[PDB]
Amino acid sequence: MIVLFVDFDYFYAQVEEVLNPSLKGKPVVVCVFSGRFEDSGAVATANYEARKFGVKAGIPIVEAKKILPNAVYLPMRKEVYQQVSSRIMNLLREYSEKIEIASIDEAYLDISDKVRDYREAYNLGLEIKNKILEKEKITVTVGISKNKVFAKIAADMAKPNGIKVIDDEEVKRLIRELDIADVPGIGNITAEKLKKLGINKLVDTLSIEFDKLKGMIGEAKAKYLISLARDEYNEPIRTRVRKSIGRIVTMKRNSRNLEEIKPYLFRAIEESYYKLDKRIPKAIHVVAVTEDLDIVSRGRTFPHGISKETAYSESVKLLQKILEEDERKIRRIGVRFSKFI
DNA sequence: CTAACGGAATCCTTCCCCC
DNA sequence: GGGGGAAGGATTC
Ligand SMILES: Nc1ccn([C@H]2C[C@H](O)[C@@H](COP(=O)(O)OP(=O)(O)OP(=O)(O)O)O2)c(=O)n1
Ligand SMILES: [Ca+2]
Ligand SMILES: [Ca+2]
Ligand SMILES: [Ca+2]
């Protein structure tokens, strides 16, 4: 295979800068205001002018303002970014019909039938970058390799407005030398689980016994890392289908009172049903985020589609079920729909 | 009514019913 | 022994 991976640079911030070019050159921070108090919330992303000083995704807004009090702080306008993203994905369809849309700013392309070698795949990456910059004035990063995992790693290496090829020779070096925490799918809890086993590179998984690795990171991640270490990973590019749609809102104050939580729950249902847009779900899940930011969920699936009225009455019964079987106060309450007709 | 923090989505694992 | 579902967990954007 020859996989071409596209990753939009600082997407949310860059879209805001395209829509307001006076933002060019300044630190821009895209925020998710929870509404509980002034500047409560987290940073969705920031451009590289702000990211260079430690303002990155996930950190609290009030911590970003202690670092950069004079940066531009904009509220997240996800529907604007989604519509811009959808147009860029339509541009990517013109280069390969095997395309896998991974997220709002990521897409894999199987270009095995469109180029002969990596030099031609490289040139196709330039043509794709120039086409996106010409149509939407958005800079992206191209990663090219023999599978999806190393194509994404390639884009991570040359990230800010770049293009990078990891050939079969560098693939083997990375199996020996790339720190295993930088492999997609290995978070801190799985990484620290590899370290305590002594595994720091992919090649280490081939010397260890399988069950000693399986019995503690799981069968799937063990097979996944072993196949990568053997240079035998080759999952195909697949069209991804949205499997669930939901919405969770932060309440103004923690509560275990039914009548106080119900307005937030009903608002989450209305917005979730608007996002359904056609699509008839057969399962509904009420999801509560407790004081300690833990996640509790109670669900129910029907032999038929779920009307909005049925979603209303069933969510209350599922919410009562959460107050019964857990005693932590709820901080965020929401709903999720799945199993579409 | 401004309080040390968002919101959304996937896949995998554990437990349990069931054949 | 294993298919299949409910709920938690880990990951990532
Ligand atoms: N914890 C996070 C991480 C990301 N995002 C959003 C903001 C990003 O614009 C988009 C894609 O995130 P990336 O991981 O691709 O990061 P960026 O595109 O912002 O930066 P980079 O240019 O390094 O990819 O997802 C978010 O809401 N919350
Ligand atoms: Ca990106
Ligand atoms: Ca991305
Ligand atoms: Ca990691």
Short mmCIF file of all heavy atoms in Angstrom, two decimals, chain A residues 179-188 191, chain C residues 11-12, ligand 4:
data_model
loop_
_atom_site.label_atom_id
_atom_site.label_comp_id
_atom_site.label_asym_id
_atom_site.label_seq_id
_atom_site.Cartn_x
_atom_site.Cartn_y
_atom_site.Cartn_z
N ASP A 179 10.27 5.97 20.06
CA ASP A 179 9.74 5.72 21.39
C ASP A 179 8.28 5.29 21.28
O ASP A 179 7.46 5.95 20.64
CB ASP A 179 9.87 6.97 22.26
CG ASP A 179 10.05 6.64 23.72
OD1 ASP A 179 11.22 6.47 24.15
OD2 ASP A 179 9.04 6.54 24.45
N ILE A 180 7.96 4.16 21.92
CA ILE A 180 6.67 3.51 21.70
C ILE A 180 5.50 4.36 22.17
O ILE A 180 4.36 4.12 21.75
CB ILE A 180 6.66 2.12 22.37
CG1 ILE A 180 5.62 1.22 21.71
CG2 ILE A 180 6.39 2.25 23.86
CD1 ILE A 180 5.71 -0.23 22.13
N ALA A 181 5.74 5.35 23.03
CA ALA A 181 4.67 6.24 23.46
C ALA A 181 4.16 7.11 22.32
O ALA A 181 3.03 7.60 22.39
CB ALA A 181 5.14 7.12 24.62
N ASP A 182 4.97 7.32 21.28
CA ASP A 182 4.56 8.11 20.12
C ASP A 182 3.83 7.29 19.07
O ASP A 182 3.51 7.83 18.00
CB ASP A 182 5.79 8.78 19.49
CG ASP A 182 6.42 9.81 20.41
OD1 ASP A 182 5.72 10.34 21.29
OD2 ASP A 182 7.63 10.09 20.24
N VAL A 183 3.55 6.03 19.34
CA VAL A 183 2.75 5.21 18.43
C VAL A 183 1.27 5.55 18.66
O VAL A 183 0.82 5.52 19.82
CB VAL A 183 3.01 3.73 18.65
CG1 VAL A 183 2.08 2.89 17.78
CG2 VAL A 183 4.47 3.41 18.34
N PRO A 184 0.51 5.86 17.61
CA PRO A 184 -0.91 6.18 17.80
C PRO A 184 -1.64 5.05 18.51
O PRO A 184 -1.50 3.87 18.15
CB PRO A 184 -1.42 6.38 16.37
CG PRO A 184 -0.21 6.80 15.61
CD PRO A 184 0.94 6.04 16.22
N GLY A 185 -2.43 5.41 19.52
CA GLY A 185 -3.14 4.45 20.33
C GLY A 185 -2.48 4.12 21.65
O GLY A 185 -3.04 3.33 22.42
N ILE A 186 -1.32 4.69 21.95
CA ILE A 186 -0.61 4.43 23.19
C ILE A 186 -0.66 5.71 24.02
O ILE A 186 0.13 6.64 23.81
CB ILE A 186 0.83 3.98 22.95
CG1 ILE A 186 0.85 2.76 22.03
CG2 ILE A 186 1.52 3.66 24.26
CD1 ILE A 186 0.11 1.56 22.58
N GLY A 187 -1.60 5.77 24.96
CA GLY A 187 -1.67 6.88 25.90
C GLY A 187 -0.77 6.65 27.10
O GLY A 187 -0.04 5.66 27.19
N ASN A 188 -0.84 7.59 28.04
CA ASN A 188 0.07 7.56 29.18
C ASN A 188 -0.13 6.32 30.04
O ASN A 188 0.83 5.76 30.57
CB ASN A 188 -0.10 8.82 30.03
CG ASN A 188 0.48 10.05 29.37
OD1 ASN A 188 0.71 10.07 28.16
ND2 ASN A 188 0.74 11.09 30.16
N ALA A 191 1.26 3.51 28.03
CA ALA A 191 2.70 3.72 27.95
C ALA A 191 3.38 3.34 29.26
O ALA A 191 4.32 2.54 29.28
CB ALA A 191 3.00 5.18 27.59
P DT C 11 -4.38 5.22 27.68
OP1 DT C 11 -3.06 4.58 27.48
OP2 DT C 11 -4.53 6.27 28.71
"O5'" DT C 11 -4.89 5.80 26.29
"C5'" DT C 11 -5.20 4.91 25.22
"C4'" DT C 11 -5.75 5.67 24.03
"O4'" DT C 11 -7.15 5.96 24.25
"C3'" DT C 11 -5.08 7.01 23.75
"O3'" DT C 11 -4.40 6.96 22.51
"C2'" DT C 11 -6.23 8.04 23.74
"C1'" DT C 11 -7.46 7.16 23.59
N1 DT C 11 -8.69 7.73 24.22
C2 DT C 11 -9.79 7.98 23.43
O2 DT C 11 -9.82 7.76 22.23
N3 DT C 11 -10.87 8.50 24.09
C4 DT C 11 -10.96 8.79 25.44
O4 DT C 11 -11.98 9.25 25.95
C5 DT C 11 -9.78 8.50 26.21
C7 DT C 11 -9.75 8.77 27.69
C6 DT C 11 -8.71 7.99 25.57
P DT C 12 -3.36 8.11 22.09
OP1 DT C 12 -2.31 7.49 21.25
OP2 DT C 12 -2.99 8.85 23.32
"O5'" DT C 12 -4.24 9.08 21.18
"C5'" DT C 12 -5.10 8.54 20.20
"C4'" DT C 12 -6.13 9.56 19.76
"O4'" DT C 12 -7.17 9.66 20.75
"C3'" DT C 12 -5.58 10.98 19.58
"O3'" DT C 12 -5.55 11.31 18.20
"C2'" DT C 12 -6.57 11.88 20.36
"C1'" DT C 12 -7.73 10.94 20.64
N1 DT C 12 -8.47 11.25 21.91
C2 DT C 12 -9.81 11.57 21.85
O2 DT C 12 -10.43 11.63 20.80
N3 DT C 12 -10.39 11.84 23.06
C4 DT C 12 -9.79 11.80 24.30
O4 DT C 12 -10.40 12.06 25.33
C5 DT C 12 -8.39 11.45 24.30
C7 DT C 12 -7.62 11.39 25.59
C6 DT C 12 -7.80 11.19 23.12
CA CA D 4 1.16 9.02 23.24
#
